[PDB]
């Protein structure tokens, strides 16, 4: 009976880790977009 | 109320309690005690105006 709860808790932990990784990826994404914008800003 | 957009801000830095120095040098560290530390420009509450 506790096996299902263990699996559910593992699911929640995996979701939290996934959310953290997604957030850091989005941060890198914003950094790259801003850097590209700055680089293209000087060209014209 | 208004808070800092942790995503859209350019230089957002999640600062914990153990590293907010505002009113430094004139308030105890993490507890009401004698004044501790030196005076310094602060680093915490993020301006939401101005």
Swiss-Prot record, chain A:
Subcellular location: Virion; Host nucleus
Coiled-coil annotated spans: 8-35
Taxonomy, superkingdom: Viruses
Induction section of the entry: Expressed in the intermediate phase of the viral replicative cycle.
Swiss-Prot/TrEMBL domain comment: Three N-terminal domains of hexon-interlacing protein form triskelions between hexon capsomers.
Task of the protein: Structural component of the virion that acts as a cement protein on the capsid exterior and forms triskelion structures consisting of three molecules that stabilize three hexon trimers at the center of each icosahedral facet and fixes the peripentonal hexons. Dispensable for assembly. During virus entry, recruits the anterograde motor kinesin-1 to the capsid docked at the nuclear pore complex thereby subjecting the docked capsid to a pulling force.
Subunit-level organization: Homotrimer. Interacts with hexon protein; this interaction tethers the hexons together. Self-interacts with adjacent proteins. Interacts with kinesin light chain KLC1; this interaction leads to capsid disruption at the nuclear pore complex during virus entry into host cell.
Further information: This protein is only encoded by mastadenoviruses, and may therefore play a role in mammals tropism.
Family: Belongs to the adenoviridae hexon-interlacing protein family.
Entry protein name: Hexon-interlacing protein
Organism from which the protein derives: Human adenovirus C serotype 5
Included stretch of the parent chain: 93 to 136 of 140
From Swiss-Prot, chain B:
Description of what induces expression: Expressed in the late phase of the viral replicative cycle.
Localization of this protein: Virion; Host nucleus
Oligomeric and partner information: Homotrimer. Interacts with the capsid vertex protein; this interaction binds the peripentonal hexons to the neighboring penton base. Interacts with the hexon-linking protein; this interaction tethers the hexons surrounding the penton to those situated in the central plate of the facet. Interacts with the hexon-interlacing protein; this interaction lashes the hexons together. Interacts with host dyneins DYNC1LI1 and DYNC1I2; this interaction might be involved in intracellular microtubule-dependent transport of incoming viral capsid.
Note: All late proteins expressed from the major late promoter are produced by alternative splicing and alternative polyadenylation of the same gene giving rise to non-overlapping ORFs. A leader sequence is present in the N-terminus of all these mRNAs and is recognized by the viral shutoff protein to provide expression although conventional translation via ribosome scanning from the cap has been shut off in the host cell.
Record family assignment: Belongs to the adenoviridae hexon protein family.
Function: Major capsid protein that self-associates to form 240 hexon trimers, each in the shape of a hexagon, building most of the pseudo T=25 capsid. Assembled into trimeric units with the help of the chaperone shutoff protein. Transported by pre-protein VI to the nucleus where it associates with other structural proteins to form an empty capsid. Might be involved, through its interaction with host dyneins, in the intracellular microtubule-dependent transport of incoming viral capsid to the nucleus.
Protein name: Hexon protein
């Amino acid at each position: 009976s506790s096996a299902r709860d263990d699996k559910l808790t593992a699911l929640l932990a995996q979701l939290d880790s996934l959310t953290r990784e997604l957030n850091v990826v989005s941060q890198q994404l914003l950094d790259l977009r801003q850097q590209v914008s700055a680089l293209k800003a000087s060209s014209p | 109320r208004q808070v800092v957009d942790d995503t859209k801000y350019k230089d957002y830095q999640q600062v914990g309690i153990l590293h907010q120095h505002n009113n430094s040098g004139f308030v105890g560290y993490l507890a009401p005690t004698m004044r501790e530390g030196q005076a310094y420009p602060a680093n915490f509450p993020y301006p939401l105006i101005g």
